[PDB]
Amino acid sequence: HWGYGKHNGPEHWHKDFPIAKGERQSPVDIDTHTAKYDPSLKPLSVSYDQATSLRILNNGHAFNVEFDDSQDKAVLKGGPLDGTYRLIQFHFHWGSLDGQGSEHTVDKKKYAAELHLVHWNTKYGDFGKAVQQPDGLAVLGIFLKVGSAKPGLQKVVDVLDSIKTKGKSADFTNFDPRGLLPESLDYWTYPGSLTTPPLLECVTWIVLKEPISVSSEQVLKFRKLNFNGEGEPEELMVDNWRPAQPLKNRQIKASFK
């Protein structure tokens, strides 16, 4: 199946998923000089105070922290978005070394990792229906750079030893995703896609300008996860990022002047 190796990685995905060569694929390079302030953007509202985390899963590609999205709790509204988008899960992409790992780039600069908070548009009723719609999803992307530790990440780091291999999960209740945000909500936005198969072109991307800082020790623990299942030869879960894709007929808008 698809992955991030030489023989099954991003350059091969198009054979099974021909939309990989589509017109609104993600991630992209964010050219900060060409990005334009958009006065039609409304204030962005990240409303995570009632979030209910449930579980953390190693899915063989990354780890997902899953939320109870059976009702409106942690949601994203405003900015470029029409209506209410419910948080379903977050996950990260990261590198084998600190100089790469992010999916989006900023003037071609690669960050050590990237956090994706995934939300679906409640007008479509369920995630599977939302991924049949052009405006079905909103992903809030946050860059990670290595410096000081992020206290609100440590609970994630410390559970990873219990989900080392593909298919393992653990209870992960009472986790507050507000502890993963930077101070500023300045952002860039554009229309794109999922960055993994099935690569569906359903996503409004909202990429925060301000990175969060995490410590070297925190990201080193990400890199101890495994792509493989239990009992199989160890393949470290590193470099689980797709490179930047052609911008094509898109513009990146900025929330800030």
Ligand X SMILES: OC[C@H]1O[C@H](O)[C@H](O)[C@@H](O)[C@@H]1O
Q: What residues are designated binding site for substrate?
A: 195-196
Stretch in the footprint of ligand BGC (CB under 6 A) among 114-122, 169-177, 183-191, 222-230? 169-177
DSSP string, the chain: ---SSTTTSGGGGGGT-GGGGSTT-S--EE-TTT-EE-TTPEEEEEE-TT--EEEEEE-SSSEEEEE--SSSSSEEEEET-SS-EEEEEEEEEE-SSTT---SSEETTBPPSEEEEEEEEEGGGSSHHHHTTSTTSEEEEEEEEEESS--GGGHHHHHHGGGG-SBT-EEE--S--GGGG--S---EEEEEE--SSTT--S-EEEEEESSPEEE-HHHHHHHTT-BSSBTTSPP-B-----PPP----S---EES--
1 catalytic? Reply is: no
196 binds, among ligand X, ligand BGC, ligand L4K, none (CB under 5 to 8 A by kind): ligand L4K
Stretch in the footprint of ligand L4K (CB under 6 A) among 16-24, 169-177, 195-203, 232-240? 195-203
Which residue's C-beta sits nearest to Zn ion? 116
Residue positions forming the annotated binding site for Zn(2+):
91, 93, 116
Minimum gap (Å) between residue 56 Cβ and ligand X:
8
Q: Write the binding mask 116 to 145 for ligand L4K: x where contact by CB under 6 A, - elsewhere.
A: x-x------------x-------x------
Residues between 108 and 127 that touch Zn ion (CB under 5 A): 116
Q: CB nearer to ligand BGC: give 50 or 184.
A: 50
What residues are labeled active site?
61
